[PDB]
Design a protein around this ligand. Sequence first.
Ligand SMILES: *[C@@H]1O[C@H](CO)[C@@H](O)[C@H](O)[C@H]1NC(C)=O
Ligand SMILES: *[C@@H]1O[C@H](CO)[C@@H](O)[C@H](O)[C@H]1NC(C)=O
Lengths: 49, 49
Amino acid sequence: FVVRGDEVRQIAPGQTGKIADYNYKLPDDFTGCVIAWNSNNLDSKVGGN
Amino acid sequence: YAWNRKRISNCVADYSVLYNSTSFSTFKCYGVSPTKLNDLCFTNVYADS
Ligand SMILES: *[C@@H]1O[C@H](CO)[C@@H](O)[C@H](O)[C@H]1NC(C)=O
Ligand SMILES: *[C@@H]1O[C@H](CO)[C@@H](O)[C@H](O)[C@H]1NC(C)=O
């Protein structure tokens, strides 16, 4: 998925916020990995995507 | 250097009201997990802004 930058820290087992409560909610036993990278070059339109 | 500090007094502390106001880049919590912040009552609270 694509999120806001200040919200990447919300993609973690224990987190609260709009993403971690209403949107995604990673489990407490995730046993995986979270890759995240800035995509302002891709997911951004000159008028705003 | 001259940081403020205030009492919070009687309150319901629901950070959900702040969700479409600004995204908190840093929301590290110590001694208390964020997920439990909605199931707790605090006898004293200070701001330190
Ligand atoms: C708060 O909600 C309104 C209603 O959709 C929205 O237009 C506004 O942008 C929200 N606040 C922020 C900071 O996004
Ligand atoms: C913050 O204060 C400004 C100016 O009074 C106001 O325009 C804005 O809506 C306020 N934001 C919130 C979340 O109350």
